[PDB]
Design a protein around this nucleic acid. Structure first.
Ligand SMILES: Nc1nc2c(ncn2[C@@H]2O[C@H](CO)[C@@H](O)[C@H]2O)c(=O)[nH]1
Ligand SMILES: Nc1nc2c(ncn2[C@@H]2O[C@H](CO)[C@@H](O)[C@H]2O)c(=O)[nH]1
Ligand SMILES: [Cl-]
Ligand SMILES: [Cl-]
Ligand SMILES: [Cl-]
Ligand SMILES: [Cl-]
Ligand SMILES: [Zn+2]
Ligand SMILES: [Zn+2]
Lengths: 195, 195
DNA sequence: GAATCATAAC
DNA sequence: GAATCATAAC
């Protein structure tokens, strides 16, 4: 079903032009429907963990979490910063970008194969088309990779709540196209300040 | 009601920053929801014609039609080409642009105040959000300003028909997001060829 | 006209 | 997960 669509990337990464990196253990691929200017997925190729729910991963598979984090902060940081530069602006330094990138799992992923999101904060993107998209990346539904186990969520109902800017906290109620306009403004503001 | 929203531009053009030009007779204003990279409206300020249906205008008010056309081809051509350059690419010549602009009325306008559309052909725009938007500008629902009276439409049902590229005629059925992707490609192609 | 919400079918 | 269609309320 549609929930298995990511399977191809960990079985045959060598043939996908949207794949940025692969080895025996992981695959780093551009999201087909990016929810920010830059939006990547890092997927484990391990057949025994790819179907483990990301909350169970966080609770019980610390070694994988730490391996994922090591790729992002280490060997793949170059690729990731360069990709962000390709997607946002060519003259952004790594330092400028390091605090404009978030890394995390969805608490209730629609796809079966374990995928870690690596994306810029802006949420400026044509593929961001409804409130549920936004809330899923800016609420506790987005389980940041460094979340203490004692703080992991579970129960959602966040998707009926009011929209708030992730950067300044302005509320927009359920007015998603107002939020969209504001996210573009926040991004122009951040970009102008950062170059 | 919402059908009267354009009234403000012909009553108080002097205060709107989206107004490009006004005199006693007409107002040229940026559409708030542009359906192409460049999308302008030219509105008569005449109180006795602004509420005349555009098909009746074409049938019975040749002098207005011809006045509108004269503004577009003459005194406002400079503004219009410069605006297109601001919206598409700064190094496009007028000749390059003259055949990438269409001028016309909707056959069934949602707004009460007579407005002539002046827009680029691309239909590449975030405000183009559904098939009805597209069809309304690329089908006979779009009454080109130079349409012979003997060829004017009336009856619609075009809005249930299949989507076709205005530039090459490829059909997309009712797959609007496929059409969107293709319009972007057609535009990149046109732009690369034209600069 | 725009925009939010709900609903199939994949 | 995406996307088409329908439906209020402005
Ligand atoms: N690269 C890629 N990403 C996808 C595909 N299908 C869904 N996604 C994204 O994967 C995430 C699933 O939680 C969402 O961000 C989806 O937009 C796909 O076929 N390829
Ligand atoms: N400039 C402007 N255009 C509008 C407004 N409301 C609707 N339109 C556009 O006017 C046209 C009406 O047929 C459509 O292209 C609408 O998107 C408005 O308030 N201001
Ligand atoms: Cl680590
Ligand atoms: Cl929008
Ligand atoms: Cl004329
Ligand atoms: Cl799209
Ligand atoms: Zn803000
Ligand atoms: Zn085409």
């Amino acid at each position: 079903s549609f929930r298995d669509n990511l399977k191809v990337y960990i079985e045959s990464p060598e043939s996908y032009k949207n794949v940025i990196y692969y080895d025996d253990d992981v695959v780093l691929v551009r999201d087909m429907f990016p929810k920010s200017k830059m939006h990547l997925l890092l997927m484990t190729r391990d057949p025994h963990l790819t179907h483990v729910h990301p909350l169970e991963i966080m609770m019980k598979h610390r070694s994988l979490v730490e391996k994922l984090v090591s790729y992002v902060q280490g060997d793949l940081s170059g690729l990731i910063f360069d990709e962000a530069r390709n997607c946002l602006s060519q003259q952004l330094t790594n330092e400028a970008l390091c605090n404009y990138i978030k890394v995390g799992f969805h608490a209730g992923p629609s796809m079966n194969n374990l995928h870690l999101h690596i994306m810029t904060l802006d949420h400026v993107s044509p593929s961001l088309k409804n409130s549920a998209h936004y809330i899923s990346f800016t609420s506790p539904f987005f389980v940041k990779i460094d979340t203490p186990t004692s703080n992991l969520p579970t129960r959602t109902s966040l998707f009926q709540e009011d929209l708030k800017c992730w950067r300044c906290g302005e509320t927009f109620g359920r007015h998603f196209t107002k939020l969209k306009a504001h996210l573009q403004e926040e991004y122009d503001d951040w970009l102008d300040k950062s170059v």
